[PDB]
N, CA, C and O atoms as a Tripos MOL2 file, in Angstrom:
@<TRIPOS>MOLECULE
protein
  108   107    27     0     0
PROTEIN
NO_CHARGES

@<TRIPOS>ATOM
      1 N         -36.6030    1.1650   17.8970 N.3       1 UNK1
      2 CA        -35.1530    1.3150   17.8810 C.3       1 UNK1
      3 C         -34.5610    0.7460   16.5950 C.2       1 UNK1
      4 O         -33.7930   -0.2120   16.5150 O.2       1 UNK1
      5 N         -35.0240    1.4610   15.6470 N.am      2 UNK2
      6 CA        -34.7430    0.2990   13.9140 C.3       2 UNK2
      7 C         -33.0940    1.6430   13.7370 C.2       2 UNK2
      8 O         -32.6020    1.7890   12.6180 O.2       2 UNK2
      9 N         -32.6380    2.2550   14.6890 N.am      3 UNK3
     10 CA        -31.4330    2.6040   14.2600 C.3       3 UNK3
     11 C         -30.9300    1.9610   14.6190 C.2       3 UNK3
     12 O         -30.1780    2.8010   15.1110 O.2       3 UNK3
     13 N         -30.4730    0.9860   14.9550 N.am      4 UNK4
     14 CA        -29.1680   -0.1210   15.1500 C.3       4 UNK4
     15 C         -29.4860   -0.7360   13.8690 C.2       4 UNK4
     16 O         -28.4180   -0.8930   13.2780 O.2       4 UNK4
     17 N         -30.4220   -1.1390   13.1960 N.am      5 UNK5
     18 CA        -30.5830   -1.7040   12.1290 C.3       5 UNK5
     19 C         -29.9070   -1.1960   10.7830 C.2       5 UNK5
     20 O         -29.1270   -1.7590   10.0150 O.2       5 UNK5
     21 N         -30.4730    0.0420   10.7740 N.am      6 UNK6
     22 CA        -30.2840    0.7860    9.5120 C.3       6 UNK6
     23 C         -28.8350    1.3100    9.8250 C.2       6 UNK6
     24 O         -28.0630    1.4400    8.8750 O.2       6 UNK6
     25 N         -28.5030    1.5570   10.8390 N.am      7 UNK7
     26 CA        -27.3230    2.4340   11.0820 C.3       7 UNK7
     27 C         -26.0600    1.2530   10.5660 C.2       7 UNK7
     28 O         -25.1530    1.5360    9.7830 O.2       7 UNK7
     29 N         -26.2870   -0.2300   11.2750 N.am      8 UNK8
     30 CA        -25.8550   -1.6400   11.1620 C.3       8 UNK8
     31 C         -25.4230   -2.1760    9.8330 C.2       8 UNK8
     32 O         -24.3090   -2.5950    9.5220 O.2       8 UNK8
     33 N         -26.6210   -2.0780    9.0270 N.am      9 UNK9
     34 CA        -26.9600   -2.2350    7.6220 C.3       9 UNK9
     35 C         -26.1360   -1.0770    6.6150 C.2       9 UNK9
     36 O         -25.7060   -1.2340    5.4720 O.2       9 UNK9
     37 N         -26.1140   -0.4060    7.1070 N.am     10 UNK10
     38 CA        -25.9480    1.0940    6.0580 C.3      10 UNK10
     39 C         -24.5140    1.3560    6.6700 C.2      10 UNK10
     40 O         -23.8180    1.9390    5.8380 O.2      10 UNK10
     41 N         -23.9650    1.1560    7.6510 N.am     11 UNK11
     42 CA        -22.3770    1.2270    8.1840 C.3      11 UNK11
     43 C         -21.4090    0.1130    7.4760 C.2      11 UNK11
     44 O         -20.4960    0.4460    6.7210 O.2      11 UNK11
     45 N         -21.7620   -1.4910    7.8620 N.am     12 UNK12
     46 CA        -21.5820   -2.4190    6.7330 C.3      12 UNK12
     47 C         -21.3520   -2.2080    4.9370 C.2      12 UNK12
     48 O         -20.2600   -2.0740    4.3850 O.2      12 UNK12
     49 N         -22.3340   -2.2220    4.4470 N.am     13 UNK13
     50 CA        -22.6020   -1.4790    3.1350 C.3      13 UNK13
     51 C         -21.6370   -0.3800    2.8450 C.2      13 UNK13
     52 O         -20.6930   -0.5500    2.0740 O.2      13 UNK13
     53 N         -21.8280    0.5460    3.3470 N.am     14 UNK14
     54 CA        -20.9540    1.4060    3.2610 C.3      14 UNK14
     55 C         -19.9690    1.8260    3.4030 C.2      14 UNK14
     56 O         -19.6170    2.9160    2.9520 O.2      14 UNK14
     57 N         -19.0690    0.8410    4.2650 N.am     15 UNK15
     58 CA        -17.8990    0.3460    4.2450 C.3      15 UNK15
     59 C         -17.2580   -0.4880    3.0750 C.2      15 UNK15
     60 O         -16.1160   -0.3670    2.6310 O.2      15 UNK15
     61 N         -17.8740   -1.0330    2.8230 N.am     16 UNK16
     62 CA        -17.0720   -1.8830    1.2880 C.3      16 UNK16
     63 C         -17.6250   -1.2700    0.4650 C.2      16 UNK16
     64 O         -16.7870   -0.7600   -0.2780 O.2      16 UNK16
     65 N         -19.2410   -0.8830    0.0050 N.am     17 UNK17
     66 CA        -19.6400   -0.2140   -1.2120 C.3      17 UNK17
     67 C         -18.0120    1.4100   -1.0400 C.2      17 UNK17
     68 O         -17.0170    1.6330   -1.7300 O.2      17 UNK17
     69 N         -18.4640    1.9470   -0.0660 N.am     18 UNK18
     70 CA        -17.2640    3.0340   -0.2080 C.3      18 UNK18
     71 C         -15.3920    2.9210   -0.7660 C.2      18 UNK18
     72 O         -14.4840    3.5830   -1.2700 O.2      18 UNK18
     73 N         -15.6990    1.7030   -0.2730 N.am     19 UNK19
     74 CA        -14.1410    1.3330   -0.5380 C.3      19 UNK19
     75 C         -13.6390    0.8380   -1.9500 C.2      19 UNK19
     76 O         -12.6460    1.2550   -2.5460 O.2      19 UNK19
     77 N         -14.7410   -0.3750   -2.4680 N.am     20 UNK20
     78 CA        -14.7080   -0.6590   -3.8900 C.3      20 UNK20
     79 C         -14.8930    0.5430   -5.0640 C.2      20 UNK20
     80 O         -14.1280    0.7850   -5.9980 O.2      20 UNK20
     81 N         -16.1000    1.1840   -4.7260 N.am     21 UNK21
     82 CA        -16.1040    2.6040   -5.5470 C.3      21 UNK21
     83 C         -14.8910    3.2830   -5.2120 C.2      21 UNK21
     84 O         -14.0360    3.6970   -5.9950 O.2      21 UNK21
     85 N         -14.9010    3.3290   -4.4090 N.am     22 UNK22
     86 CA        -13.6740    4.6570   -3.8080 C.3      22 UNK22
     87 C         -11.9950    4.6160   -4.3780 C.2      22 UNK22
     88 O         -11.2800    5.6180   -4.3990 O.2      22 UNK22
     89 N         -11.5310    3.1600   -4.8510 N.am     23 UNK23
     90 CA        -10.7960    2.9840   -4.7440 C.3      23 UNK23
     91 C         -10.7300    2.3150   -6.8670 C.2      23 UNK23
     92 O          -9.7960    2.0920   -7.6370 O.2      23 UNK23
     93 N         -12.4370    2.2310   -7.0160 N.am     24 UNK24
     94 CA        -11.9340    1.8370   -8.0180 C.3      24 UNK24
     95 C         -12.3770    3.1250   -9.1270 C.2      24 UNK24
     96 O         -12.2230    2.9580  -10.3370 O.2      24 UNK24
     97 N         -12.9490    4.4370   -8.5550 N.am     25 UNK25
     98 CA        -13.2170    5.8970   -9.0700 C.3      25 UNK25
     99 C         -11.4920    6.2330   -9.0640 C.2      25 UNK25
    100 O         -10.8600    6.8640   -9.9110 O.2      25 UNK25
    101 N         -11.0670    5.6840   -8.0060 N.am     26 UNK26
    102 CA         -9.7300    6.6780   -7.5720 C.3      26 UNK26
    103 C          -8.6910    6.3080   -8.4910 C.2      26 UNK26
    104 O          -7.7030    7.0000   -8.7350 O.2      26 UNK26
    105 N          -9.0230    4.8960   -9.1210 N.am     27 UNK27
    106 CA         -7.6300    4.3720   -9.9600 C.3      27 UNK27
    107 C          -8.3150    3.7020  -10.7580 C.2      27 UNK27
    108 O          -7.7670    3.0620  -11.6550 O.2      27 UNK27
@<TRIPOS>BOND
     1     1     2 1
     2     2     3 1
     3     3     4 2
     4     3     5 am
     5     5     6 1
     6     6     7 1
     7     7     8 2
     8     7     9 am
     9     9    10 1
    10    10    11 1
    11    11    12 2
    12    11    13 am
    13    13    14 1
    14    14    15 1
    15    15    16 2
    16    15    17 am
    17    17    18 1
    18    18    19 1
    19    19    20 2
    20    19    21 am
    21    21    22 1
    22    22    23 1
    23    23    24 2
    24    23    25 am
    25    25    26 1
    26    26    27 1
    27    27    28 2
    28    27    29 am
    29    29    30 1
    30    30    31 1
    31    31    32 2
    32    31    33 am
    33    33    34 1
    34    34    35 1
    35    35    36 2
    36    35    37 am
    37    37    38 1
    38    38    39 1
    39    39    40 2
    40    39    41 am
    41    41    42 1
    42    42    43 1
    43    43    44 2
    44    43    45 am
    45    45    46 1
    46    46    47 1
    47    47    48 2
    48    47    49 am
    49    49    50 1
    50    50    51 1
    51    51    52 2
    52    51    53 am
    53    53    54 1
    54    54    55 1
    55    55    56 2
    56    55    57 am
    57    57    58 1
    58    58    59 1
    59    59    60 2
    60    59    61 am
    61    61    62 1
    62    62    63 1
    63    63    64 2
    64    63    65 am
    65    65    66 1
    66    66    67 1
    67    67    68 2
    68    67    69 am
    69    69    70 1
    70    70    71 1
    71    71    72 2
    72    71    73 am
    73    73    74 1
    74    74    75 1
    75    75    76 2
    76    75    77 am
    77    77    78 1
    78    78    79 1
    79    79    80 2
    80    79    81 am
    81    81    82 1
    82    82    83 1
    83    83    84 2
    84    83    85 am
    85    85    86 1
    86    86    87 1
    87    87    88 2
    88    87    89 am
    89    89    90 1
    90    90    91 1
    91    91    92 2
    92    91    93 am
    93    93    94 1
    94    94    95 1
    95    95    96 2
    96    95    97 am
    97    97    98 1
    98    98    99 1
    99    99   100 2
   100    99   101 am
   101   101   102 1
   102   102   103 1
   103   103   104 2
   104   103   105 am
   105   105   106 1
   106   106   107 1
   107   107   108 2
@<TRIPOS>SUBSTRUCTURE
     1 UNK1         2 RESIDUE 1 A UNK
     2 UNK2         6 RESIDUE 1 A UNK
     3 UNK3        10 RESIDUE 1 A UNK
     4 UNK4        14 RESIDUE 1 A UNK
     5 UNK5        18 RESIDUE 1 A UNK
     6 UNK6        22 RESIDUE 1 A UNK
     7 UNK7        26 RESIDUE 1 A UNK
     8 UNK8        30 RESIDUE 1 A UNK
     9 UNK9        34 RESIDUE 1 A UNK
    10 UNK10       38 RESIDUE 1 A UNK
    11 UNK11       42 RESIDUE 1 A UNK
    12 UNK12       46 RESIDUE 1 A UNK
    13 UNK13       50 RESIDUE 1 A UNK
    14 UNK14       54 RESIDUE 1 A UNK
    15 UNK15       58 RESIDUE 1 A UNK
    16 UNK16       62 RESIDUE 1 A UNK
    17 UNK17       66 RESIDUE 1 A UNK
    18 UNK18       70 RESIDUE 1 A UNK
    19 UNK19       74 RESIDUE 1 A UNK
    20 UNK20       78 RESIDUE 1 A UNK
    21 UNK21       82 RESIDUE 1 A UNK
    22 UNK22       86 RESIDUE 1 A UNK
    23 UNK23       90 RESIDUE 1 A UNK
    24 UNK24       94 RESIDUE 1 A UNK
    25 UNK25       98 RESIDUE 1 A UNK
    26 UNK26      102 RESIDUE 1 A UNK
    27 UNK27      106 RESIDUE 1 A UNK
């Protein structure tokens, strides 16, 4: 069951990695 992990890991992450890029691509 290593998807709670990765899903955990990679939902996290990808919440701020998305947001810092996202916001600093956007402006």
């Amino acid at each position: 069951k290593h998807m709670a992990g990765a899903a955990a890991a990679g939902a996290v992450v990808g919440g701020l990695g998305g947001y810092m890029l996202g916001s600093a691509m956007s402006r």
